[PDB]
Amino acid sequence: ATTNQLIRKGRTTLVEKSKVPALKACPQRRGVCTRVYTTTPKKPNSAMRKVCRVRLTSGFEVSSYIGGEGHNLQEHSVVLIRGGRVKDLPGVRYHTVRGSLDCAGVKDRNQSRSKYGAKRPK
Amino acid sequence: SMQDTVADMLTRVRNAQMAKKQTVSMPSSKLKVAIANVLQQEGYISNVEVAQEETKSTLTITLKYFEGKPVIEMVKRVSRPGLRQYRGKDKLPSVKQGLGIAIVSTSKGIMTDRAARAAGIGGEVIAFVS
RNA sequence: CACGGUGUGGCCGAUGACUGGGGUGAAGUCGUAACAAGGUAGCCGUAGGGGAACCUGCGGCUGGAUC
RNA sequence: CAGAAUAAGCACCGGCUAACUCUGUGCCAGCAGCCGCGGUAAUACAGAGGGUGCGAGCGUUAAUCGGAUUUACUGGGCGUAAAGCGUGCGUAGGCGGCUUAUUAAGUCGGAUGUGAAAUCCCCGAGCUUAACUUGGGAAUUGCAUUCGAUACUGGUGAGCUAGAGUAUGGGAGAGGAUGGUAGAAUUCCAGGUGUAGCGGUGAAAUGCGUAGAGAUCUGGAGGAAUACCGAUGGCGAAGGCAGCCAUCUGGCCUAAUACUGACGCUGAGGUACGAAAGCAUGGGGAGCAAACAGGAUUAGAUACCCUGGUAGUCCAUGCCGUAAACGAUGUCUACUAGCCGUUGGGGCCUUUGAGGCUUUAGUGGCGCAGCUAACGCGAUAAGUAGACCGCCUGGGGAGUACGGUC
RNA sequence: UAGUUGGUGGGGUAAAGGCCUACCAAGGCGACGAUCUGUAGCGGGUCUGAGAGGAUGAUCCGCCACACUGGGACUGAGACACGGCCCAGACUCCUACGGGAGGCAGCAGUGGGGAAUAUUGGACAAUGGGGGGAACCCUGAUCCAGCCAUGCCGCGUGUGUGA
Numbered sequence: 001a002t003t004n005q006l007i008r009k010g011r012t013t014l015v016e017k018s019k020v021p022a023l024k025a026c027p028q029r030r031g032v033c034t035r036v037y038t039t040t041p042k043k044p045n046s047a048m049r050k051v052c053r054v055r056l057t058s059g060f061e062v063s064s065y066i067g068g069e070g071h072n073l074q075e076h077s078v079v080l081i082r083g084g085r086v087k088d089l090p091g092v093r094y095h096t097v098r099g100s101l102d103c104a105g106v107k108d109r110n111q112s113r114s115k116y117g118a119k120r121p122k
Numbered sequence: 123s124m125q126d127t128v129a130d131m132l133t134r135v136r137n138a139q140m141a142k143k144q145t146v147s148m149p150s151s152k153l154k155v156a157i158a159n160v161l162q163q164e165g166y167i168s169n170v171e172v173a174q175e176e177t178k179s180t181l182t183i184t185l186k187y188f189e190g191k192p193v194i195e196m197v198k199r200v201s202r203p204g205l206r207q208y209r210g211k212d213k214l215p216s217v218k219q220g221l222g223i224a225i226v227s228t229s230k231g232i233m234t235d236r237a238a239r240a241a242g243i244g245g246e247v248i249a250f251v252s
Numbered sequence: 253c254a255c256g257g258u259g260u261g262g263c264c265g266a267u268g269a270c271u272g273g274g275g276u277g278a279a280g281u282c283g284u285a286a287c288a289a290g291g292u293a294g295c296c297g298u299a300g301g302g303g304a305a306c307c308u309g310c311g312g313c314u315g316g317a318u319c
Numbered sequence: 320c321a322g323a324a325u326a327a328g329c330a331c332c333g334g335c336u337a338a339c340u341c342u343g344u345g346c347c348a349g350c351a352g353c354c355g356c357g358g359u360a361a362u363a364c365a366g367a368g369g370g371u372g373c374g375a376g377c378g379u380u381a382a383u384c385g386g387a388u389u390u391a392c393u394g395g396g397c398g399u400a401a402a403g404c405g406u407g408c409g410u411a412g413g414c415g416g417c418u419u420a421u422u423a424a425g426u427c428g429g430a431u432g433u434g435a436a437a438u439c440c441c442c443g444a445g446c447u448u449a450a451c452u453u454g455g456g457a458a459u460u461g462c463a464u465u466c467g468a469u470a471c472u473g474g475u476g477a478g479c480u481a482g483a484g485u486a487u488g489g490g491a492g493a494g495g496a497u498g499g500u501a502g503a504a505u506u507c508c509a510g511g512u513g514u515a516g517c518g519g520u521g522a523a524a525u526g527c528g529u530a531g532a533g534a535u536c537u538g539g540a541g542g543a544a545u546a547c548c549g550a551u552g553g554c555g556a557a558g559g560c561a562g563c564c565a566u567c568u569g570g571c572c573u574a575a576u577a578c579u580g581a582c583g584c585u586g587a588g589g590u591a592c593g594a595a596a597g598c599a600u601g602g603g604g605a606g607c608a609a610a611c612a613g614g615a616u617u618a619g620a621u622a623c624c625c626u627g628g629u630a631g632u633c634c635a636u637g638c639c640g641u642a643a644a645c646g647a648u649g650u651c652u653a654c655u656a657g658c659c660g661u662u663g664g665g666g667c668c669u670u671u672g673a674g675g676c677u678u679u680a681g682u683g684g685c686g687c688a689g690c691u692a693a694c695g696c697g698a699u700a701a702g703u704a705g706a707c708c709g710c711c712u713g714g715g716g717a718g719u720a721c722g723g724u725c
Numbered sequence: 726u727a728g729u730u731g732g733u734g735g736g737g738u739a740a741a742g743g744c745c746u747a748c749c750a751a752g753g754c755g756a757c758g759a760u761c762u763g764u765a766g767c768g769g770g771u772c773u774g775a776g777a778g779g780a781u782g783a784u785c786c787g788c789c790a791c792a793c794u795g796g797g798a799c800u801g802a803g804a805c806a807c808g809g810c811c812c813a814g815a816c817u818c819c820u821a822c823g824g825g826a827g828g829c830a831g832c833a834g835u836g837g838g839g840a841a842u843a844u845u846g847g848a849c850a851a852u853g854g855g856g857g858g859a860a861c862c863c864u865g866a867u868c869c870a871g872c873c874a875u876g877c878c879g880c881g882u883g884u885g886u887g888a
Contacts, residue, residue, distance in 0.1 A: 123414095123415070123416090123482070123483095123583060123584045123585095123651060123652055123706080124415085124416080124482080124584095124651095124652045124653060124705075124706090125414060125415045125416090125583095125584080125652080125705060125706050126414095126415090126704085126705045126706080127416080127705095129653095129704060129705050130652090130653055130654080130704075130705075132704075133653075133654060133703060133704040133705080134653080134654055134655095134703095134704095136654090136655095136703065136704080137654050137655045137702095137703055137704090138654085138655080140655070140688075140689080140702095140703075141654095141655055141656075141688080143655095146654095148653095148654095149416090149417085149481070150417095151416095151417070151418095152417095152418085153470085153471080156470080177417085177418090177479065177480065177481090178417095178480090178481065179417085199704075199705085201471090202705070202706090203413095203414060203415075203472095203705075203706070204413080204414070204705085204706065204707085206425090206426090206471090206472070208425085208426055208427080208471095209427095210427075210428095211427075211428075226470095227470050227471050228426095228427070228468090228469095228470065228471090229426085229427060229428085229468045229469050229470060229471095230468075230469090230470075231470055232470060232471090233470095242428075243427060243428065243468085244426080244427050244428085245426070245427060245470070245471075246426075246427095246470080246471055246472085248471085
């Protein structure tokens, strides 16, 4: 561009959108479990992965993955959700914090315990 | 149309050096003669001549080649009609860490950035030569 | 003069029986339009026709093979 | 005074990235920031052993700048990757030839005042050290007033002709608008000669014909288009423009004097022109031919092929405003090896008439330097520079919805 | 845009002024963005960046504005006044039904919201502020204490020997 063109119209910046709109710029959110179920991965992956549709205090309804092996979640549980995508599951952009409100820490786990929220064995 | 005669002169010199001519000629003006005088004093060119027929004035410059390459390896116009550039005495540009010269027009005439800093004045930055 | 009332008209937002198109997924069904001269060279504008990719008329381009 | 007595966890070990093996499970369970692991030997899943990095902390999520030259002022692009408006004219604006005198607005320099303290940085001081506190500096890149300089830009006065334009001679052209007119051919009609086929296809059939075709000869009617010349030719801003003649009319090339004296370039908004198809009103209709009808082909044919055929294609008066409207290359100016063609002019030379050198404005083919990712471009630049404008910022959704104008 | 832009006479203010008023005139602003509309307290500063820039305005300091929601004025040197007055509105409380009362965006604290942020503490000894001649009184400013690994800095959880 010429100097005159820049003076008449300056450079324009395009705004950026967040990848976790439902959090509304908060580290975590609290929600009530609306539907717990399992889904199947996108190709070339094959499994049965545990997810749940949750309604948040932000006024949104989203889907959240459940990490670890073995959970006690069910209908109407109260859970804390954080950010993080599952990649091979389309549309699942959030994670459930293990052992926070009604979710419990995984059992018989001795490494990476701070994740999955398992206390020290005696 | 032609709107920057100084840029035209610098372009003529650059093209002549790249084509390996011995002399280059153009329509003349006092500003062009003043710039050519500074170039000759600094040693980038050999001879500057002015001829007058009746009212037309022709300026002729003799070029220098040392070894195989031309002496002037780079000449850039800095101030242009679409953007004038003015510098204070403490912000005069340095060319190739002092191995090249910046041509500056000050209230005491046309000189190099070195002489301008010595005299403690600023002005318009015409060109970089190296 | 604040608050309030009446009538009429704007704008924003939420909501609505029904309806239209878009994307993603899985390849269930009907074909084979494009990629080679892809088996009628392809594409652009416009008009008409057709279950569907598309077909035909007029003008244009080579980002068309062989001669 | 007492006595080691009261006091270590968290993440990770396929690559990006320092640190590897064994068991358990078998596209399951599961991991995952990106690329990707697991479908019987998993250094990538879980446990264990070992190790690595941190350490009263260790990890995850969220947010800002950076890396991102990924809005490019410093510091990017537009032939083919995204990107030059279809083409002109022109308003505001931006920029603008040479010489001279003057002004001191831009520009540069000095002085004075101000720019609170805290904060940042430097030299010290006090905290057992450090954080922290604190003295003095430096800095606060700015603003205002006043005094100076005049090279450049701007203003004013004067002058000049290389840009731009005017008058007089000559030249080429499918440039435009209007009206006449000529020949070839197709269709139809009328009439002679004449008698069983004609037509069409890969092969056929639909179709035409014994109330007489097709073929051949004569005459008539009507519409549309202009063979040969014809050309990598010409003219036009682009879209485009071809028989011949007259009338009205625009631009271009070329020679020398004369004249004005910067009167210039570009151009947001705006405005004019703008292929084909399409629309409105009235005419015309030979040939061709969307839609449609029939015959074939095919598994099916909606198509390609064949026989017919209506809008339309043509004219007058208006609208529409879009094309791969392309050189996929905005306009203007200057400079930078050569070789070979062609169109319209000027000049010189022979020497008698046809050639040979130059110069100018167009139009083509190669190619040095230079440029480019490469292909390629290369005086008709995509090279070297200047002025102004338009446009681009991953692929889809999408030149779409809503609103508005026409 | 019609008190709108300017002028004259008058009024009004501590003070210039369409600040108000009666006439006279038709001006004033706008592509250098008027009007309308969305968002927003501003600066010294803070974070990042080689710089140019970008993001930001907790804690400290200066300025501005507000005090349940709107409209007013009084007293006073000074207010259109957080813990003053009048009026209107919504809400809450006491009542013997006669009549009344109130405003934590001061400190502590409760409910609610939220991923999430503390004690219904001590003293005016120090620095300030108000009153008083003084003695002295008041001061949730302030100076201190309590809670929280929230951050920065420092220390410890032992040392040598021992195959």
